[PDB]
């Protein structure tokens, strides 16, 4: 849209899909998703001013159930041909458009982005269900300072059955390891007034830990196969 209601800076870009998440390239597709609001629902908002000269952006993007991992290889690989093609800031050259400087504030919404396909040199099928993951940037990200206030709604986390990569088992969304009941990591990164460069202040709710001596051994062995930081954070309530 152009000039909604009449007054220059007001718009409505939106886009909708229903998609499966992540399919890979040159070969074969990684076939994520294999799991009523609908895919990459970028409803983007934009109110910005001519007598500003200044791109502002109000990005309401939702993910509903995907999984947008594109890792491919060991490094990020087909990740780095991802941010290679898509990544392009709207170069608008034309007349009566000098550029005007870029400027970001997300308000991002990844519900229900389930990550269990996370490629490593050797994972065992790792399984990571997440609820939401609400990067709410209401701060400018493209700055020294970034306000993120990842207030995440009980997450979990299941293993798969074996360390080497081949891992079967009865069921494969499998016993809890480590369960989060909230963590509003709300980083300030300086790149609550602490001067200290990257002060990631991940003031962290609580860990709830369930175990058995197979289970957590077997984690032990996945982690080992596989500047302020003021937490204040609860270590574990674990039931172990």
């Not at 990544?87 to 400087?101: C, E, K, M, N, Q």
């Not at 369960?179 to 962290?204: A, G, Y």
Request: proline share 5%; net charge negative.
């Amino acid at each position: 849209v152009s000039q909604y209601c009449g007054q220059p800076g007001l718009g409505y870009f939106c886009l909708e899909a229903e998609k499966a998440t992540l399919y890979h390239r040159a070969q074969l597709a990684p076939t994520i998703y294999p799991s009523g609001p609908h895919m990459l629902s970028t409803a983007v908002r934009i109110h910005l001013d001519p007598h500003k000269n200044v791109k502002e952006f109000l990005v309401t993007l939702r993910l509903h159930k995907a999984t947008l991992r594109h890792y491919m290889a060991l490094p990020e690989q087909s990740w780095h041909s991802q941010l290679l093609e898509f990544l392009d800031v709207l170069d608008d050259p034309v007349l009566g458009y000098l550029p005007p400087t870029v400027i970001t504030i997300l308000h991002t919404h990844l519900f229900s982005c389930s990550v269990d396909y996370r490629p490593l040199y050797l994972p065992v099928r790792v399984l990571i269900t997440a609820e939401t993951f609400t990067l709410s940037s209401n701060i400018i990200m493209d700055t020294s300072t970034f306000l993120l206030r990842f207030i995440l709604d009980d997450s979990a986390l299941y293993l798969s059955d074996k360390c080497e990569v081949e891992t079967l088992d009865l069921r494969r969304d499998y016993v809890c390891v480590l369960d989060v009941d909230l963590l509003e990591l709300v980083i300030k990164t300086w790149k609550k007034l602490s001067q200290p460069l990257f002060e990631l202040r991940c003031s962290n709710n609580v860990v709830h830990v369930h175990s058995c001596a197979d289970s957590c051994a077997l984690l032990v062995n996945l982690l080992q196969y596989v500047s302020t930081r003021v937490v204040l954070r609860e270590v574990s309530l674990v039931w172990h």
